[PDB]
Symmetry: D2
């Protein structure tokens, strides 16, 4: 008989049998970060279709942000990019009430954080190719694509540096974020869920420098042959009219995250 | 308030709020398939360290197979490569008693099947770049790497076609495989499991043609800087002595798999 | 004690890590799949891209996806390409022949790109090229640069090509006069150090083939999206696609006499 | 055929898709990070790869990782390279100068490979090259071909370079005589159509710099692993690493006079 048994005060991910690590309440994710952060106004009714019962949509707004993380401690010095898509919500739990960003989808260009995000915290991470920013100052751009098929373009024209009070306001702000997810695991060979729970991951970045500017984005609808596992996600978000881009900032700094600060909410 | 609610007779993966598909007990995976399948003899006691209690290791053997899937239905005609690493076991359950292959690890070069396999069936799938076969007949080879760092080389020299009665035997062996996995989902912000169960995925392929030959493989140890999320997996594998490659075949065909036929075993 | 080339030898940069003895019978041998389309466009517009010395035989652009495997000279490797050409007659001072003038070839691997350019003046450049995506009877590929789609190709197979039809198609493919222009710029000055037209007789042996309904679409790019190629893409995109005039999907192999390429004049 | 080249334009294949007006002050501008090592080796072995006409000044191989970002001629794109060179003296019939004889450059984007080779005889070839992996004080990269590792570089920063040391460094990096060999083969015959040495005066403006402990490791490849390049890699691997003589990590920018390159003889 097999000799593998999990240890009591350890944490794991599949494959568990190759071992894991001692639980530490003060486990950290540390990394350098750049973010291009946009908000756009859309149609409330249409966006509500994508927000689960239990949450209230606080504003007819979608938040879309490119982030690039470098010198990542838990990846022993590697890097990755992500596109975050969220909506501002209030959670009306039976135990917890709080405001945050309901995560719609996150694209990332590396699998390891995808697995971790989904399995540990119910963040709806999926893969895409995500260019680092192309820069002809004052212009910044990225492109996101699935197997050669473009589906999101972002552009930003920096118009000025944020300093003084306004930078304090910006900093103080970014420092605290309530990221909300939904960890769902399906039944095996049957409809429905084996596990289904909402999750809060408190995070924040320490902004060092910031610019304001003119932001834009564009979705390109995809066919199943183009993006078989994601076409309907893309096409759903593309259906949300971009009425106006209301916010656009480019920030540079670091993050120090208490990964064990995540918790189930209900 | 949000308008999204799951449908009763539907299956989902995160993000659930972008919808799913109606359950069909006869949901199929169909694809063309090439497999380069090796087995090697090793040390029993070392291999037993990675087999969960409840399983009995039936031989001191590791099975390692390159597979290439094309014309994949659920990926709307897409493709991907993998490396399957398993050992022969008997599950000694309180309810189920059966023999199959305990999946130690699977590398794939595409995220979609990695998420599905982990979340739907507990197959411990992770990411690596995997070369298509390089072919200078009778020599065939692949190389498996992580962010530029080689960790697995596989080589095969074809020495003969398998025909007639012996081809009939091989087809049989391949038609029915009991793939065994472990679906584990960690608690949020605490040690241990929220979900922990063993799973069976009955599968197998329809072999059309087969060649026998001389197989070899070589593991290359990785540092945490090279493969931060996987080094210990690679290195555990590397530590299992390759006393002799005992089996080496190269098969082509197709697969027709009953996806909803996977089941939890206990 | 130093490096000197051998008289016997063929080289590519870097020459000093050595080369190989010339063989007039050096081959390229590979398995091959092709999705071959042609479309009718506007003569005047196309001629803008054809060098003086060539006559455009027809208002036609040939666009073909090829996938080469078990490639001998790549010791068993593979790559994909998109070939774009037009039918021409070369009115040389010595050479007089019909061929396919190469507008551009995208490849997804650098080695054939450097070889093609430097040995034979084939205008090879890089892009990401998907393998065929296949849900029969539908086939598709997407070509992109750093995440930016610029070509989509689609093909719906309507039937197998056989008998005399297959003989004809085999003939079409077996012998192809591929025409290039090998141009090397002067260093630190306008103009050319080397400028010559090249013929590379090649093709493929077709084994099996399907006919069907073909389509292609170009997506114009900006400089920030494809800084070295936007103007190529946008030129090709400017050629109206009036009619798709041939669409075939073929499988076989190729046996190419590499040293059969010659300068034409 | 309506395409004709313009007199005072510069081109690269495909010429027929246009080019650019010559500008003697054409610039390459970019941000640059370089991890620059040198090692001592055996003179007699290194000399085998150095062409006649050049004298090997010291038995030294320079290996540097560079990352370029915000590049003008790539409209804000980026790429990585590994530069491998040896210090030489050119005993020309006309030109007499010292510089670095470029042995091979690996780059992870095809556009600069094409330009470098065809414009200046710099022996660029493709590899996958990781951006630096960083767990301070440790920095690393890995370089590979189709998944097959062939070069690992490591660096442990031990301090800042300041004052006089920094001025020395700035001066070392600012003015570099990069040397190449532009070679283009005969079509279908052995030998050269074009064979000339080339000087590209370049160099970067170092803002900040760290000193530390550097290492490197080559891994030999087989032809199935690396068909186009294995002999280059294996040649380099064969050069013993007797001592790492310099190791620095710098951070700055470059402003290069692209049109300042010239044939030397
Ligand atoms: Cl995915
Ligand atoms: Cl891009
Ligand atoms: Cl190359
Ligand atoms: Cl100059
Ligand atoms: Na923590
Ligand atoms: Na396929
Ligand atoms: Na995927
Ligand atoms: Na690499
Ligand atoms: Na890799
Ligand atoms: Na072999
Ligand atoms: Na691309
Ligand atoms: Na030949
Ligand atoms: Na390129
Ligand atoms: Na190589
Ligand atoms: Na690989
Ligand atoms: Na690979």
């Amino acid at each position: 008989q097999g000799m593998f048994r999990p240890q009591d005060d350890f944490t794991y991910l599949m494959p568990v049998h190759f071992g894991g690590g001692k639980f530490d309440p003060e486990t950290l994710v540390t990394q350098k970060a750049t973010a291009l952060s946009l908000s756009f106004e859309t149609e409330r009714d249409l966006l509500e279709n994508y927000i689960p019962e239990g949450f209230e949509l606080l504003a007819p707004e979608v938040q879309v942000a490119f982030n690039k993380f470098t010198e990542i401690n838990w990846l022993h010095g590697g890097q990755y990019n992500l596109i975050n898509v969220a909506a501002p919500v209030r959670f009306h739990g039976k135990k917890d009430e709080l405001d945050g960003a309901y995560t719609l989808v996150v694209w990332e260009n590396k699998t390891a954080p995808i697995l971790g995000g989904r399995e540990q915290t119910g963040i709806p991470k999926i893969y895409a190719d995500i260019e680092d920013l192309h820069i002809v100052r004052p212009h910044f751009a990225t492109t996101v694509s699935y197997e050669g098929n473009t589906f999101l373009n972002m552009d930003f024209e920096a118009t000025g540096s944020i300093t003084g009070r306004d930078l304090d306001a910006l900093k103080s702000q970014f420092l605290t974020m309530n990221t909300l997810g939904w960890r769902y695991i399906p039944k095996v060979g049957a409809p429905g869920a084996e596990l289904s729970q909402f999750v809060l991951y408190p995070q924040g970045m320490e902004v060092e420098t910031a610019e304001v500017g003119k932001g834009s984005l564009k979705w390109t609808e995809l066919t199943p042959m183009q993006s078989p596992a994601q076409y309907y996600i893309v096409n759903s978000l593309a259906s949300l009219p971009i009425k106006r881009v209301t916010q656009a900032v480019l920030v540079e700094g670091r993050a120090i995250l208490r990964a064990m600060g995540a918790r189930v909410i209900e």
